[PDB]
């Protein structure tokens, strides 16, 4: 109920769902790139 | 782009400003000189009037004689050839007496005596100019801050030319007259005393010279930024704090956590500039008399890697 | 420890969260660079030596 | 935590990036987006200087030195213990300086004043980048930049200067030195004059700008004015830094010998080169 | 005295450097206390004195005897805004911006702020008014540069808002301070010379849009301007930079607002 | 602010519009950072090209500082 | 198709929305192509990892075809 | 992680997104530069 | 009772609970990473 | 190039945009692979 | 100890908490760097010598 | 009742109690860390 | 000694407490650094030599 930004709870929930979807997509792309690099040249 | 107030975009010219008459003897003040449009684009266009007092006359005569003595020595070194004089103008030098003569005034005229004559003229000229600054402040009822800042500059100058040669017991330690010659004196002074960079007082002098450049950049930039509020009229801001002084103070408070006042910034300015020559004179006075090699001194004081 | 929530009665969450994000990223970068500087735990050099990459 | 007049100036707006996300103050400091960036870069640089002190093996602050990569490494990266730390600290320093300038831009916009202060700071940033980035890149090695030590960057200055004989003979160096000396002289004069006007002889009334102009006209026959003196101070400092950056950017890139050898061109002009006598004859 | 040490490596050079460190600490203390003569004691965002006042204490008060019988000024001393501040707290916590309650340019808050100074003209050394219109200044005339008198005045919205009628000059400094601009309604406003760009054909005022020229505070006397009026005019014009931004027709601003 | 005439892009569901707006904000920030980084890289490249044109390799200065 | 509750993204001017939609179409095509390419690269990497696990280097076949 | 969405009621969404894009690009550049620093993984060191 | 941020006790408790949830998630990921590094290369 | 816009009255915009994104990515991959083919410009050949 | 709470009558909790956080972080970093400087207690180098990583 | 900061006596007491709880938790963690280090590698 | 409390009638308690905190921390750091500087009383070196860690 703090509302420093004027967003309601439902708006915050929807925006966070969109943001987390994007975050997981970006993380999956990064994981794919890391798998490619690790196969090409592992660092462990 | 917007107007940055670096150059005036229009000039207005009125009657020549004859100046205040607090206690100044108006007889000794000259007439107003020409108005310079070129100077008006940047500051005031008015030239003069200048005050020609007793100390002013003494200083002008002594400085003219010093300059003329150096010039006649340069003409002698040129073989009286104007082409040679122009070719080697920066390479001519009026060197002090050789070390064999110590502090004695028995050095021959072409081997150090003329340097002593020119140095006497410069000494009288500079000290009479200091008295002139003091008395010009006194005649207007102003404080003697200019006199004391000039005294700091004179302290460095006296250490270079008079005090340190006396403490070292030789006029050869003093600075030759000439452009490249005194540059070479600076370089050789650093080399002889072992990398003057490791003089802590030379380091402080450089710190305050850099601080002077930094502080004048900051202050000029601040006043030009707040000049849209009449911030250039600083005495008014001291007497009646306007929005210009407040905006300058708040800019610097929000930038670096602390600020000055419209008057206190000028205390910062005068002290930052004074400490340059103060620490410089102390550092030059210590060189040779107390420390003969500054790199070894820095090694013994944890400023250099070895030892 | 049950009253630690009162830290938010003193500090506004916006400035605290900004400061905490800066501090945490700074700390993580510092530790990673400390590890990279040492010959041990420099995982890139460890892998280079393991797979004979550096001549 | 606020000055007696600060309250009416703390208003939203003026930010370049972030809107109201970082539009707040921490004590007296205005943070902003670039303030967050500046603090991060500054803390990282300071902690890395401390860590480089750890690696070097000395805790004496005057002996702490972060040397750039050796000339063998060229312009590429280097191991952290032997030049990479210097590169990271240089990146952090450049980021901190640029973020500081942009934070000053934000503060200027908030206060409605001109951008003279960040613009003047940009000159110092450009001189720093000349010494650490532009000149080493032109010469092709990070080892031509100076170490981050209190007394070792003085060693860098000394060695770089004596590489070209007496560095006094660099003409752009001469111009920069004359600008620096003139700036110090003008700063002393300006501070002294304003203080003398504002603190006259005891019991006398405060003076006016007319008194200042009268004093300097009676002294040297000319008065530049309050606006004039502040313009002059800004221009002298900026010109000094510009000409020092120029002198270092031409040294080792388009000039390689002793600088007195440069000054020989005036001596060897056709109409007086062969005339005997003088110094160079 | 080369190599003469009182103890350890401490010699005359070490004595000098440590004594200078002491002197520098004392000088920094003195300079900061001198800087603490305005804006102190510190206040909270509501107005009450703050718990924190800083490591440096307030200096003992000093008195300036103002020229021309304008009284005295003792600093540090009790100073207040002496004007209502139309700002509202945007957060209970300190360190956050205060939003204007109404029109900030009219309210005189933010970049449009002004200070309640003396409502008297600024005087020169002789006691006469420092800033006077060039028509009332004896012998003053434009000496160089483009004469702005007669040129149209264009606002930040690229619309003409009046014409320059007169130049207000500082008699001692002999430099232009204010341009007097006649608007469409026949009344005249003042514009600081530092906020106007005198071009070949027009005078461009990037700070204010045309419609805001009427809102510039007016001078109660056609021949003199007081410090308070100067502060109000300058504050209004400068605050126009941040508060007339929507009306400003900058192309870069338009492109940035396209993507923002 | 003026209405677009194309009107074909309006057929997207509003949640995809929200996702596009979030991606656009992130891409705007990243693009400004990338512009700064590539401008710095181009400045370095310009100075490197100038250094290549100049005869630095023919006569280059020794190491100003002890290697470390 | 259901209306978004956020409503803050709606403040963008419609021409920027059109630009975002065009960029989104191009990015969707490029992302599908990139997914195909990275899936192929991951298949190749999986087979390379399996080949590394197997003792191919210990005993590997000669060249089936004349080199060319 | 159920109530992390409330962080968008503390920080403005679009501002955080712009700042986060800047941060992600700068972090990517930093990691690439650190990789270029090491002799291994220095993919721009194509040599004879 | 004490007021410096405008948050009530309930709002402060909710904010602190969410913050502690984030802190414990971050600490769990850090502990997993530390276990992985210690197994890969112990430092004690 | 004044009347090139009429190509959008021949080909559907969104379909062309999707196909063009595919084409641009595939072209970029093709050029990168050709560069990796040559011994010079083979940036993935980090060697001792 | 009984009346030490009155320190908060003198010192603002926000100022003191910020100062204490900065002080504690700087002190902890200082002590860790002191330990890392000494060849003993440099736990990274100790582990490297214990498991013979440097070879 | 000096009240430089405006806190009342009850507010100061509650704040100090919570602060000392935090300080004692921090001190206990530090003591455990020191015991671990002293066991692992004593400095006396 | 009885009237020493009157020092608080003269000295602002908050400024005195800040100055005293800074002074005590700096003094303690100075003494610890002096001890660490001397080859003896550098407790880290003493512990290294006692348990023969430096080898
Ligand atoms: C070797 C040294 C060689 C020296 C060569 C000469 C150099 C001269 C330099 C002078 C610069 C003057 C600049 C100036 O204008 O002053 C403005 C200013 C003028 O005040 P004002 O309010 O405007 O006067 C109003 C009058 O109505 C109107 O004022 P006024 O017109 O009458 O004049 C202003 C006043 C100003 O003059 C001064 O105040 C001089 C102050 C001392 C300057 C000398 C410093 C030497 C430093 C050496 C350090 C050791 C190195 C070894 O002049 C004087 O009163 C006499 C000055 C004569 C100078 C003689 C120098 C010898 O000077 C001051 O009065 C304040 C100065 C404050 C200095 C504080 C230093 C602190 C001392 C140590 C404290 C220890 C604390 C320990 C803490 C440690 C914690 C770790
Ligand atoms: C190889 C050269 C040596 C070296 C050797 C020296 C020596 C030697 C000296 C300095 C000095 C100084 N050096 Mg050093 N210096 C070196 C490297 C540096 C570097 C650098 C980046 O490398 C810097 C920034 C500096 C900076 C400085 C200044 C801080 C300082 C001079 C202050 C000043 O204004 O003097 C110039 C100002 C004056 C001399 C005062 C003049 C006042 C009088 C009254 C003027 C009379 C004018 C006359 C009448 C003419 C009137 C003309 C008419 C009006 C027309 N040095 C190296 C290590 N340096 C000086 C100093 O103090 O050192 C501690 C000094 O003596
Ligand atoms: C705080 C230290 C700085 C400083 C201060 C300073 N110098 C000063 C003053 C002050 C405060 C004066 O009041 C005084 C002055 O009148 O300035 C306008 C002066 C002055 N500083 C001067 C020069 C000068 N200052 C220098 C340096 C500096 N001065 C320091 C950086 C330098 C150098 C080398 O850096 C020079 C060349 C003069 C303009 C003037 C002193 C004039 C003088 O003594 O004149 C007598 C000599 C002649 C009249 C010869 C004339 C020869 C021909 C007729 C021409
Ligand atoms: C261009 C004219 C002069 C100038 C101007 C100038 N400088 C300025 C300004 C202006 C107008 C400001 O607005 C700004 C300011 O706020 O000043 C108070 C600034 C400033 N001028 C500064 C200093 C400074 N200026 C200098 C020079 C000059 N500044 C020019 C001569 C010098 C020197 C050596 O000549 C110094 C030391 C700062 C006070 C400030 C910029 C503050 C800043 O950027 O803070 C962030 C950075 C840090 C806190 C540093 C630590 C973090 C870094 C990441 C590490 C850097 C390590 C460094 C590389 C090590 C160097 C060690 C040395 C011994 C080698
Ligand atoms: C305005 C301030 C401008 C500072 C720039 C000027 C620097 C001059 C310093 C002179 C120091 C000196 O002379 O040393 C000998 C003098 C006296 O000799 P000393 O022997 O008694 O002290 C040196 C101590 N040992 C030997 C252990 C190294 O030392 C001092 O006066 C103390 C100076 C300490 C400076 C510490 C700087 C720390 C800054 C952070 C470092 C980040 C990297
Ligand atoms: C390791 C590096 C440590 C950095 C921090 C040191 C803090 C030392 C203890 C400060 C303290 O007790 O007061 C806290 C105070 C908090 O009190 P405050 O900010 O509320 O002060 C109120 C203002 N008075 C009381 C003067 C009216 O923090 C500071 O002021 C810290 C000052 C640090 C000075 C750094 C060295 C300068 C020489
Ligand atoms: C003579 C010229 C000497 C130049 C060398 C000294 C320059 C540094 C000045 C430091 C300073 O003023 O500290 C005050 C400020 C104190 O800032 P503050 O945060 O405590 O606020 C101002 C203090 N009161 C309110 C008491 C006025 O120091 C700093 O903010 C940090 C400076 C780091 C250097
Ligand atoms: C020196 O230290 C080194 C560099 C060596 C090591 C570094 C260490 C450190 C400290 C690293 C720091 C790491 C951190 C803190 C990383 C943080 C990463 C985070 C939180 C990233 C978040 C990313 C979020 C994104 C990109 C969200 C994007 C959202 C959208 C684009 C909107 C949604 C849109 C979608 C899903 C498009 C969907 C389209 C299709 C076709 C399905
Ligand atoms: C040189 O020395 C070295 C570096 C070697 C050794 C290092 C030493 C030091 C000094 C180490 C320092 C350690 C410290 C002090 C670490 C501190 C760690 C902490 C305190 C971490 C905290 C993490 C917390 C996190 C990640 C919390 C995240 C929270 C969220 C993601 C959710 C936020 C959202 C909220 C609260 C919504 C609330 C809103 C409403 C409306 C209720
Ligand atoms: C060079 O010298 C070396 C480094 C070798 C040796 C070092 C020497 C020295 C000088 C060491 C210095 C040691 C000192 C002075 C250490 C001091 C440590 C202290 C005092 C630490 C204090 C820690 C306190 C903490 C972590 C408290 C945390 C509190 C909380 C998390 C709760 C806060 C919430 C509150 C108060 C709620 C407010 C209440 C209401 C009702 C609103
Ligand atoms: C062509 O047109 C003519 C010839 C008419 C005029 C031309 C003049 C020319 C070409 C002038 C050239 C002047 C130059 C190049 C001057 C250079 C001056 C420089 C660079 C000076 C640098 C440093 C000087 C210092 C530090 C001087 C210090 C002197 C003192 C502290 C005074 C010492 C006082 C002494 C020894 C008094 C001894 C005497 C008695 C009776 C006790
Ligand atoms: Fe000024």
Author numbering:
A (entry chain 8), I (entry chain 0), L (entry chain B): 6 to 49
B (entry chain M): 1 to 307
C (entry chain 9), K (entry chain A), M (entry chain D): 1 to 55
D (entry chain L): 1 to 281
E (entry chain H): 1 to 260
F (entry chain X), G (entry chain x): 2 to 69
H (entry chain 7), J (entry chain 6): 1 to 48
Task: Give verbatim excerpts from the published study on this entry.
The reaction center (RC) and light-harvesting complex 1 (LH1) form a RC–LH1 core supercomplex that is vital for the primary reactions of photosynthesis in purple phototrophic bacteria. The RC–LH1 supercomplex comprises an RC surrounded by the LH1 ring that is made of multiple αβ-heterodimers. In contrast, some Rhodobacter species, such as Rba. sphaeroides, possess dimeric RC–LH1 core structures, representing the largest photosynthetic complex in anoxygenic phototrophs.
BChls in the Class-1 dimer form a continuous S-shaped array, ensuring that solar energy absorbed by the LH1 BChls in one monomer can be transferred to the LH1 of the neighboring monomer. The N-terminal region of PufX (Ala2-Pro15) is well resolved in the Class-1 dimeric structure, revealing that residues Ile6-Asp9 interact with LH1-1αβ of the other monomer via hydrogen bonds and salt bridges. In the Class-1 dimer, three UQ-10 molecules were identified in each monomer. Coarse-grained molecular dynamics (CGMD) simulations indicate that QY could move toward Q3, while the Q3 molecule shifts toward the QB site, reminiscent of the diving of quinones in membranes. Extensive interactions formed at the monomer–monomer interface eventually create the stable and photosynthetically active Class-1 RC–LH1–PufX–PufY dimer.
